[PDB]
């Protein structure tokens, strides 16, 4: 237990084991026009993050796996060269070139998965 953002410089795998500690300080704490505008702004970012979470089919879960594969043109590095080798900050810095494409592919994959389940449940 390191606290909020404790594993900032740690490896990605080490920070992955403590995800609740960062999730519980996104809308709570201690939070006149300035003060109220930030709260309304803050809640929109949480709903921005939760709406994308639900549209991919990861509603209410901190670790969810998908159906899309990994494209090598995004990044050629290996698993042991990521989880025990890099921090989340530099990872987000390097992969910040194709995030929108990945988000769109996740959206469409979850949509087709929902359509497939609706087709299958008709027997």
């Amino acid at each position: 237990s390191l606290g909020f953002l404790g594993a900032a410089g740690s490896t990605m795998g080490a920070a992955s084991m403590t995800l609740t500690v960062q999730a519980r300080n996104l809308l709570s704490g201690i939070v006149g026009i300035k003060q109220l505008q930030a709260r309304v702004l803050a809640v929109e970012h949480y709903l921005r993050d939760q709406q994308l979470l639900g549209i991919w089919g990861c509603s209410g879960k901190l670790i969810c796996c998908t159906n899309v594969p990994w494209n090598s043109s995004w990044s050629n590095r290996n698993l042991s060269e990521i989880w025990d080798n890099m921090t989340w900050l530099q990872w987000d810095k390097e992969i910040s070139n194709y995030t929108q494409i990945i988000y769109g592919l996740l959206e469409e994959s979850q949509n087709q998965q929902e359509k497939n389940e609706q087709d299958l449940l008709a027997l």
């Epitope: 490896t11 795998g13 080490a14 042991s80 025990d84 080798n85």
Partner: nanobody, 128 residues
Framework: QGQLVQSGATTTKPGSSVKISCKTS????????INWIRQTAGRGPEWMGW????????????????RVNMTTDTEVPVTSFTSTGAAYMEIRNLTSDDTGTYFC????????????????WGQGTLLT
């Protein structure tokens, strides 16, 4: 990426103690261990020892237990993930039998079962 540059190729007669520098660039100098390995002509490649430029915890071979001295200074952060550091190494009871080419190599990872493994090597220096 990352690159490591070594000292000059100077020679000295037995009985002395020489220091070899190793300057790092292009990576977090604190995130990986550093190893020193010597290639001798009349012997095989010998792992001498590694130190941690983050914890300062050292571990050498028993053959170099009381004869080799290895130190580092603090890093200079270039960016959030790039740093520049240095590493120095000396031998106390030095003779002419330890002649060879010395290499400084940064560690492989910062976690796992192959952390300190010498991964990224230097240019090599020629001794007496």
């Amino acid at each position: 990426q990352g690159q490591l540059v070594q000292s000059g190729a100077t020679t000295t007669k037995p009985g002395s103690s020489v220091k070899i520098s190793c300057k790092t660039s292009g990576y977090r100098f604190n995130f990986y261990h550093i190893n020193w390995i010597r290639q001798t002509a009349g012997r095989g490649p010998e792992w001498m020892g590694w130190i941690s430029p983050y914890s300062g915890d050292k571990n050498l071979a028993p053959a170099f237990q009381d004869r080799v001295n290895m130190t580092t200074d603090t890093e200079v952060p270039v960016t959030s993930f790039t740093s520049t550091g240095a590493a120095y190494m000396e031998i106390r009871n030095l003779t002419s039998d330890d002649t060879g080419t010395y290499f400084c190599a940064k560690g492989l990872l910062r976690d796992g079962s192959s952390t300190w493994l010498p991964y990224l090597w230097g240019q090599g220096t020629l001794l007496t």
